[PDB]
Design a protein around this ligand. Structure first.
Ligand SMILES: O[C@@H]1[C@@H](O)[C@H](O[C@@H]2CO[C@@H](O[C@@H]3CO[C@@H](O[C@@H]4CO[C@@H](O)[C@H](O)[C@H]4O)[C@H](O)[C@H]3O)[C@H](O)[C@H]2O)OC[C@H]1O
Ligand code: NAG
Ligand code: CO
Ligand code: CO
Length: 434
């Protein structure tokens, strides 16, 4: 796609801290950009929609190539249309925003400059952030994570994409998503099937795969830490049901692991750790600090801080695994006790280390789940299972929760706030900010 300028593109600014082994941190000035799927897509020469509701213009977009030539992405009114605001080191994303139309959530990338994404090399380093999840009920997900995106959002590889990172192009994740309207500088119109339950979305013949590090998938009831390996580390197109993942008929068909080696303290038996009010170890009505460390073994370690008190990832016992570090033993024992071979099939933490050793883009998103109502995160999944199936219960939310239409109508003012991002060598981020 090209880019148009009927509405101007000003990325909301956002600062964060780069910290050093020597114990100081210094401020970095970045900004955030909304993914292309949320944008208006129209004819380069007019205001005629290339994409409308959940279908494409059959004349403008008779095929992927022609569509991409005819069509541009335009600017975003971040606050008024998308409910996205920043203030210093603080980002907020509202759930439902009402302008001329209704908007649901946002997916945002951190920018290095107006035209390029910021890449972080995770291995050997740690990432710290503050989050307020108090306004996030069952069925919602305020997500902070990393994906192996190209810093330019695909421009150098596919010159028919001239919009780039500036317009939030290039997305890929471990689901090989097929809901994307542009992949590899072409439209996804060929094979498009509009969604049965979502007025604004559909599923194309192509998807976009890549490694994904889910630092934080969470609401006020449940939270999960999840690495997802792919046989191809970086962004790569996939064809139809070969994509695998959520958007395909067959989940395990493809090149990515869409399940991941997930760590959810509730799922692992400690139901007292994380939730709303004073009866939990971490009170989700208040802001909390989340620190995630990527040791060079490829294992992942985690601690939390709330009102000056530090808590490690809680100990979990699972088969012959015991401890709080997400390592090969945990992941192998998880597959053994909970089932599945997708993580080990795609190479485990070894394959995943190849992504953390390379550059990854920071994503911050707020979403509801039109596919499984977020039950896999905060409820019992599949829903026919009981507490007697190992790993079935992942939170305290009803199996009736998170119908998108319901939660959008009842909880339009839901929102997430991420703040005080700090990145550097392991051990460094608890030092005073610059
Ligand atoms: O000036 C007018 C333009 O502002 C208007 O632009 C519309 C802005 O909203 C666009 O709809 C977006 C599409 O993305 C939805 O998010 C989905 C969430 O789930 C994800 O899996 C999926 O990938 C996302 O697409 C978002 O909620 C929704 O608001 C709409 O298409 C634009 O056209 O166009 C008319 C102009 O006059
Ligand atoms: C859950 O984890 C916290 C933090 O490690 C711990 O203090 C608490 O005792 C755990 N709860 C249970 C019921 O074991
Ligand atoms: Co193709
Ligand atoms: Co270790």
């Amino acid at each position: 796609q090209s880019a148009c300028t009927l509405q101007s593109e000003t990325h909301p600014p956002l600062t964060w801290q780069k910290c050093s082994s020597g114990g100081t941190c210094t401020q970095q000035t970045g900004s955030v950009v909304i993914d292309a799927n949320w944008r208006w897509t129209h004819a380069t020469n007019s205001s005629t929609n290339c994409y409308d509701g959940n279908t494409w213009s059959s004349t403008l977009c008779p095929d992927n190539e022609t569509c991409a030539k005819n069509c541009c992405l335009d600017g975003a009114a971040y606050a008024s249309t998308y409910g996205v605001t920043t203030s210093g080191n603080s980002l907020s994303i509202d759930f439902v925003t009402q302008s001329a139309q209704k908007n649901v959530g946002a997916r945002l990338y951190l920018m290095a400059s107006d035209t390029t994404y910021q890449e972080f090399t995770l291995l050997g380093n740690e990432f710290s952030f503050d989050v307020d999840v108090s306004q996030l009920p069952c069925g919602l997900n305020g997500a902070l994570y990393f994906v192996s995106m190209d810093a330019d959002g695909g421009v150098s590889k596919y010159p028919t994409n001239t919009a780039g990172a500036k317009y939030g192009t290039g997305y890929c994740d471990s689901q090989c998503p097929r809901d994307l309207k542009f992949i590899n500088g072409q439209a996804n119109v060929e094979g498009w099937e509009p969604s049965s339950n979502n007025a604004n979305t559909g599923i194309g013949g192509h998807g976009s795969c890549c490694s994904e590090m889910d630092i934080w998938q969470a609401n006020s009831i449940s939270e999960a830490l999840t690495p997802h390996p792919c046989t191809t580390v970086g962004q790569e197109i996939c064809e139809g049901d070969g994509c695998g993942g959520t958007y395909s008929d067959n989940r395990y068909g493809g090149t990515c692991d869409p399940d991941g080696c997930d760590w959810n303290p509730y799922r692992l038996g400690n139901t007292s750790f994380y939730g709303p009010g004073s009866s939990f170890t971490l009170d989700t009505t208040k802001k909390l600090t989340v620190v995630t460390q990527f040791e060079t073994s490829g294992a992942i370690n985690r601690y939390y801080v709330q009102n000056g008190v530090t808590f490690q990832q809680p100990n979990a016992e699972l088969g012959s695994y015991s401890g709080n570090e997400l390592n090969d033993d945990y992941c192998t024992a998880e597959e053994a006790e909970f089932g599945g071979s997708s993580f080990s099939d795609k190479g485990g933490l070894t394959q995943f280390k190849k992504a953390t050793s390379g550059g990854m883009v920071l994503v911050m998103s707020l979403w509801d789940d039109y596919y499984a109502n977020m039950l896999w995160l905060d409820s019992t999944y599949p829903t026919n299972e009981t507490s007697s199936t190992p790993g079935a219960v992942r939170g305290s939310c009803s199996t009736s929760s998170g119908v998108p239409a319901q939660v959008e109508s009842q909880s339009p003012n839901a929102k997430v706030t991420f703040s005080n991002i700090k990145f550097g060598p392991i051990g460094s981020t608890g030092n005073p900010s610059g």
